[PDB]
Design a protein around this ligand. Structure first.
Ligand SMILES: Nc1nc2c(ncn2[C@H]2C[C@H](O)[C@@H](COP(=O)(O)OP(=O)(O)OP(=O)(O)O)O2)c(=O)[nH]1
Ligand SMILES: Nc1nc2c(ncn2[C@H]2C[C@H](O)[C@@H](COP(=O)(O)OP(=O)(O)OP(=O)(O)O)O2)c(=O)[nH]1
Ligand SMILES: Nc1ncnc2c1ncn2[C@H]1C[C@H](O)[C@@H](COP(=O)(O)OP(=O)(O)OP(=O)(O)O)O1
Ligand SMILES: Nc1ncnc2c1ncn2[C@H]1C[C@H](O)[C@@H](COP(=O)(O)OP(=O)(O)OP(=O)(O)O)O1
Ligand SMILES: [Mg+2]
Ligand SMILES: [Mg+2]
Ligand SMILES: [Mg+2]
Ligand SMILES: [Mg+2]
Lengths: 434, 434
């Protein structure tokens, strides 16, 4: 039920924090927002790849993408919360909740939803995985549990993001110490790395936490009241209802903005821009304003602003139509896939894949990223092995100012993923002496 | 009075927008926030100098600084608005205002408060001015009005920010079309470029708009009901009350974060970090937590988080103590200057000036920036003069995809200030063929 889903608990708490005992100027979710804003992991997003590597231009990075997702998520959360308190009046009438709380939760979750991504993006994650699969790290296969090896060979940015958010350090336990509602709404694949893709459900495409933090998530999963889907030997719970909204906001934003940026770069003609969006923007377009503009940028910006407004309302309608199934855990798709504009979205995505992801420029950067990440990971792993050599001591002093082998390897992968693109490239040249 | 200060009017409006007729999910100030978030001028802040040029590291840029100022400003606005509606109940009881509106106004104003700054920062502005003062642009002195020449030789980032926010383009008038309350709260020097520093008041140190937009500000200044301070031949109004809060937030944030970054870089020892902040953090510090931490970063982050919380409350107290004078226009200082911690702030600022601004690293970058900006401005100005040469046509096609001389020169200065540091450097090398 909804009372346990909006928990204000933080790690290490003993008492019970109640909504009616909060300070209304600064609620806990706003504190979460402010704690994410002021941290270094959030700042490192400014020079991390969204689509085009090493482009910190007029193209998007992870930071600006996260900000746009935050705005869209705040809007979605406010509408859905107003409709929910309309449906269940006891929430507001007894517990003391307002529709701004839902917006704060979704905004905070959407702000930190990519905070664990490594440099170079998808190619970076695949390179980290291939290093342990077919490279040097393969030699560790026999020393590790099967699920730990699966963690290392299918490295996921979501698990690393959870690790960053809930990291324990000497003298400061809990990390950022976010609320449990925010951690639940941030969590989109509540399962371990094995088994690999059991079903066709949407919460099974990947995994969301490592083996070193499973216990932590267990605590979270038992406070919110999430339904359990497996207890044999591998735990898996159902989604928090607001993770659907977070995912919808992320999908809308990147789907539209990638097209707009590709048009502005010179890779997609504007005829496609009008053709694939006339249906989306037809219900609110004022042709006069469209015909007055004299630049491609103004036209594409107008079209994007209209399309986002249409899609947000459609998503809210879908969520309120399937609320019961979502709360019961039986809803196996995304809110976007149940929309009237699926064909247009698929056409835009296919055009983006053909014209942007496979561009020469984009390709060369990913190959360079593969080389850089492999070099840095091999250096760290060889330093971890010997430990007695002078060279090993130098590498330790440069790249790292009692734990198990799995903990050491996962820490190595986490430290590689903190770097930006430029810092990784600079370290690569310094290692090579170039 | 306060009823006219919180105006929801936009440029080109004919009717009257009322607060009670708004959609509560998305008020106008949130629309302003979202319009700033999604624009290209805001995105260009990601690679612009805050203190250390060409450092897009773990140091701050203009974008992250603006986000932190937005958080602090939202908090300040919420507290001040709650106290105001406590003082004047008729606002809420009749007009229908809530204390979140003040926070939205201050957050939107603080988000765009540096949007007109050029690359390389203060050195960049001084280079643009010196170009017209002692360089090529001096030849235009005889063709321009005195106030226009003063505009060109004392180039200000605030005037350029107003120009960016309220720019008119073919087919889209008004630019971002922000609310008038937001434009007033963004405006901190409501005067022209002449006379130069008439008095010791705080609204006279600089100027806030160009001659090409004076008329525009007049409209704004007459809708809010701002008091007039000069009508002889040069217009000058008093400050919007919330500009004080915007300035306080900006001062707090940069004053603390510059010290923290200098400590993390290796230019200031940590002994000073404890010595100059023990008084600030003494009222809420838990020594146990401070002694548990084992890294400099954790300690300085803790101290910064405590200091910001102390300063915010002190600023709110000062504002509510001098509200009457501020509303009457007789308050001639800043809220920070009337605080109990002025000595500590001055010590930290002096240490920052001695240790960070005059570092070798910082110095070399500013000299390079002077060279780059002078080259680009001279190229644009020589292209504007001749117009018939083949080279001039090439420069026009590269650097610029019926107006007066002053309009052309101010547009040149505005187009130079859109570039980031990296883009300016790349264009400089391409001009030199290197
Ligand atoms: N360059 C490049 N970019 C890609 C490729 N595949 C995806 N992208 C970029 C384009 C999208 O804007 C961006 C979205 O990345 P996400 O990790 O957020 O993807 P997704 O929504 O599938 O999220 P997920 O990790 O599955 O939850 O990734 C690729 O093969 N090459
Ligand atoms: N590198 C360098 N940075 C400087 C210098 N002077 C100021 N800064 C940097 C440090 C501060 O964090 C930052 C603040 O710039 P602002 O333009 O916001 O200054 P201010 O608050 O005086 O604002 P204003 O334009 O007068 O309203 O400028 C300087 O001489 N060199
Ligand atoms: N409903 C929404 N909620 C949140 N963000 C939105 C919404 N609609 C659009 N956005 C995003 C993308 C837009 O570029 C930006 C500004 O929105 P907005 O100013 O309402 O768009 P617009 O130009 O279509 O305006 P209007 O509807 O007044 O004509 O915010
Ligand atoms: N009152 C405030 N309003 C807005 N932002 C604030 C405030 N105080 C601090 N900040 C900024 C700077 C902090 O690094 C960041 C997070 O604040 P916060 O979590 O309250 O600080 P803290 O670590 O001192 O916590 P606490 O008071 O719970 O011990 O937000
Ligand atoms: Mg994302
Ligand atoms: Mg709209
Ligand atoms: Mg600033
Ligand atoms: Mg605090």
């Amino acid at each position: 039920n909804w009372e346990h889903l909006l928990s204000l608990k933080r790690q290490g708490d003993t008492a019970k924090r109640l909504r009616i005992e909060q300070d209304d100027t600064r609620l806990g979710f706003e504190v979460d927002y402010d704690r994410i804003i002021f941290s270094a992991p959030f700042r490192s997003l400014q020079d991390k790849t969204q689509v085009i590597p090493l482009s910190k231009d007029f193209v998007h990075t992870r930071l600006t993408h996260s900000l746009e997702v935050s705005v869209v998520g705040r809007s979605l959360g406010r509408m859905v919360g107003k409709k929910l308190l309309e449906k269940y009046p006891h929430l507001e009438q007894v517990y003391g909740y307002k529709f701004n709380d839902f917006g704060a939760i979704v905004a905070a979750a959407a702000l930190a939803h990519d905070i664990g991504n490594p440099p170079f993006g998808a190619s970076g994650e695949k390179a980290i995985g291939e290093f342990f699969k077919n490279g040097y790290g393969k030699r560790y296969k026999d020393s590790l549990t099967a699920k730990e090896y699966q963690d290392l060979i299918k490295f996921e940015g979501n698990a690393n993001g959870f690790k960053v958010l809930s990291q324990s350090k000497p003298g400061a336990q809990g990390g950022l110490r976010l609320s449990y509602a925010t951690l639940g709404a941030f969590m989109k694949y509540p399962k371990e790395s094995l088994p690999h893709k059991p079903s066709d459900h949407i919460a099974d495409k990947k995994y969301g936490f490592f083996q070193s933090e499973r216990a932590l998530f267990e605590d979270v999963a038992q406070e919110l009241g999430l339904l359990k889907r497996s207890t044999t030997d591998d735990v898996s719970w159902s989604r928090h209802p607001l993770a659907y909204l977070v995912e919808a906001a992320d999908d809308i934003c990147y789907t539209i903005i990638d097209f707009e940026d590709g048009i502005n770069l010179g890779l997609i003609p504007e005829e496609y821009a009008l053709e694939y969006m006339v249906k989306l923007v037809g219900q609110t377009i004022d042709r006069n304003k469209y015909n007055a503009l004299q630049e491609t940028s103004d036209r594409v910006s107008y079209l994007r602003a209209l399309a986002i407004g249409t899609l947000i309302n459609e998503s809210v309608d879908t969520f309120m139509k399937y609320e019961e199934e979502i709360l019961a855990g039986t809803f196996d798709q995304s809110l976007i896939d149940k929309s009237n504009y699926q064909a247009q979205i698929t056409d835009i995505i296919n055009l983006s894949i053909e014209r942007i992801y496979n561009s020469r420029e984009v390709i060369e950067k990913e190959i360079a990223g593969y080389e850089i990440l492999s070099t840095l990971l091999e250096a760290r792993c060889r330093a971890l092995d010997n430990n007695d050599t002078h060279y090993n001591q130098l590498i330790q002093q440069l790249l790292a100012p009692e734990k198990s082998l799995y903990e050491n390897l996962i820490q190595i992968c986490a430290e590689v993923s903190t770097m930006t693109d430029g810092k990784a490239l600079r370290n690569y040249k310094k290692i090579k002496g170039l």
